[PDB]
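Example 239, ligand chloride ion.
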Amino acid sequence: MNPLAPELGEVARFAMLASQAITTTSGSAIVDGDLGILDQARSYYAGFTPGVNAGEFDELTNGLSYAGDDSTPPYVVPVPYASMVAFINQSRTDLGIAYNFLAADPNPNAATQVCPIELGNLTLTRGVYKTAADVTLQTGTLTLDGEGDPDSVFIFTIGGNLTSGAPGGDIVLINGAQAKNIYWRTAGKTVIGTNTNFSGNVFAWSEVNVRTGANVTGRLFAVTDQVTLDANAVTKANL
Ligand SMILES: [Cl-]
Ligand SMILES: [Cl-]
């Protein structure tokens, strides 16, 4: 059966969310999602350009950035929260819930399959793919095949790191597969290779490092450390 996707709660609003820091080199463009740092002040944003209105970054369209030290005035507390601290509190809790959902075996509605340690040149159907080792996506393209059902859910749950890179590293979606229904969970870090096309919601326990020029469609979560960008186009997957 189709795997049950995690509940994201408040953190569905974020394109990127980290405990410690979100950083970028120049040349990044983030769209359709918010940015958040949960456990450090706004000073832990690096590389971004504050825009006209409080919370805006020039690099960020249809979204705002958030940190718990954001005062009102001039920042704006998201509805319906009474304070920015309360908004960060619910976001922190809901991130933990969703990471834990993806880390727990088995999924409530689907049996676990083996995740290959190299995902290049494979075509995979929906399901839950688990391994305790590290996973690489580099020999070629990973094609995710929704078998004609736009609701098909893909969960990759990984006890080590996840790294895409050269010579391949791209993710292609066919037959109904959608970025919003793909989930990547690493107990280690997630590293996305230079100039690749990546799809899915990344829940890295430690950090997410997106390398030069990669294109992300999905979400980037670092539960305990940081999300770093290097000239990336990041688009939040539609709700
Ligand atoms: Cl684990
Ligand atoms: Cl999508």
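Summary: The longest strand covers residues 197-204.
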